[PDB]
Design a protein around this ligand. Structure first.
Ligand SMILES: *[C@@H]1O[C@H](CO)[C@@H](O[C@@H]2O[C@H](CO)[C@@H](O)[C@H](O)[C@H]2NC(C)=O)[C@H](O)[C@H]1NC(C)=O
Ligand SMILES: *[C@@H]1O[C@H](CO)[C@@H](O)[C@H](O)[C@H]1NC(C)=O
Ligand SMILES: *[C@@H]1O[C@H](CO)[C@@H](O)[C@H](O)[C@H]1NC(C)=O
Ligand SMILES: *[C@@H]1O[C@H](CO)[C@@H](O)[C@H](O)[C@H]1NC(C)=O
Ligand SMILES: *[C@@H]1O[C@H](CO)[C@@H](O)[C@H](O)[C@H]1NC(C)=O
Lengths: 50, 49, 99, 99
């Protein structure tokens, strides 16, 4: 059976806050297509073969 | 029938293209369902309070 | 949108039939627990932070920014006065310093 | 009772594959997102989830939209009553109207 992820529980309270004292810098790669192949078809030659 | 199947084999590879297109549609639907909802990394839960 | 975290900048890189981004992001790392209150009672006046939150380490109360732990003494420069102490739920007592 | 459309299309070779994620898993994802939003605001999207009181989170939202947080901390009961009445109106509209 597929696992959705880890089980976590936020310790919520009336007067409890969590504040970071340190950080990290990340570099993430995002890949996106832009253009495809500029094909062309010779219709008469493809159908008939001269 | 069998003669219909033989003439369908003579017509070539249209059915494979249609089956491939429908398979791509189904995989894309699964990808959309994953992409919209599966954004959180961990399964949080509410406190009893 | 532009990467996972708080986005800073990106650098585009070319690719065959596409483009590739390099999203630079800021991500907090090491959190700590603190005791918090929405406002401070001082001589019947309710003091609220101008930019930041009130935190406590057990004995003293400080004003700090949201995304980093930089505690500072509660003054009248970083707090503003609004109303009295009988309206806000969860207010606590502390001495607001004045320079 | 005679023949139906689903058996006709099944006998003629047209099937419907089940989705990969069941409705229980979809509800688990929405419950996880909702619990993270309620208990941490927006910090769980940026990084690790950080606990915060909900009144202080709504003060963050009010400072985001441009109203000072004393308005929230003085009108908290009225804002909570308006939110509860709005949620009840939404559930009544979904119970009555099916359009
Ligand atoms: C915040 O985190 C960074 C790294 O995540 C810490 O930097 C490290 O500090 C130790 C202690 O001297 C060094 O041995 C490492 O070489 C440092 N790493 C890097 C990449 O420079 C930093 O100390 C942390 N901040 C605090 C206040 O603890
Ligand atoms: C939070 O406050 C409510 C009412 O003010 C109270 O019922 C509840 O026990 C409190 N919870 C904690 C953890 O203090
Ligand atoms: C302290 O913080 C951690 C995560 O930052 C949390 O798991 C833990 O329950 C907190 N403890 C208290 C006493 O608030
Ligand atoms: C809280 O921080 C202040 C500021 O340095 C310090 O004087 C005090 O001892 C701290 N209280 C503790 C660690 O209980
Ligand atoms: C704060 O000081 C006032 C001054 O009389 C007192 O009545 C009150 O009990 C103190 N504590 C709180 C939590 O308001």
């Amino acid at each position: 059976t597929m696992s959705l992820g880890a089980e976590n529980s936020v310790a919520y309270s009336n007067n409890s806050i969590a504040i970071p004292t340190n950080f990290t810098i990340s570099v993430t790669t995002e890949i996106l297509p832009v253009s495809m192949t500029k094909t062309s078809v010779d219709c008469t030659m493809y159908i008939c073969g001269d | 029938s069998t003669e219909c199947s033989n003439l369908l084999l003579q017509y070539g590879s249209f059915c494979t293209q249609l089956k491939r297109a429908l398979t791509g549609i189904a995989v894309e639907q699964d990808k959309n369902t994953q992409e919209v909802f599966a954004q959180v990394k961990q399964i949080y839960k509410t406190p009893p309070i | 949108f532009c990467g996972k975290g708080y986005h800073l900048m990106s650098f585009p890189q070319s690719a065959p039939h596409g483009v590739v981004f390099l999203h630079v992001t800021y991500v907090p790392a090491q959190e700590k627990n603190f005791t918090t209150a929405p406002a401070i009672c001082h001589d019947g006046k309710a003091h609220f932070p101008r930019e930041g939150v009130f935190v406590s380490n057990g004995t003293h109360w400080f004003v700090t920014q949201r995304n980093f732990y930089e505690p500072q003494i509660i003054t009248t420069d970083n707090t503003f006065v609004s109303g009295n102490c009988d309206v806000v739920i969860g207010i606590v007592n502390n001495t607001v310093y004045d320079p | 009772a005679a023949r139906d459309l689903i058996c006709a299309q099944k006998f003629n070779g047209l099937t419907v594959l089940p989705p990969l994620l069941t409705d229980e898993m979809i509800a688990q994802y929405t419950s996880a997102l909702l619990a993270g939003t309620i208990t941490s605001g927006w910090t769980f999207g940026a990084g690790a989830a950080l606990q915060i009181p909900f009144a202080m989170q709504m003060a963050y939202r009010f400072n985001g939209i441009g109203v000072t947080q004393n308005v929230l901390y003085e009108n908290q009961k009225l804002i909570a009553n308006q939110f509860n009445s709005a949620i009840g109106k939404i559930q009544d509209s979904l119970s009555s109207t099916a359009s």
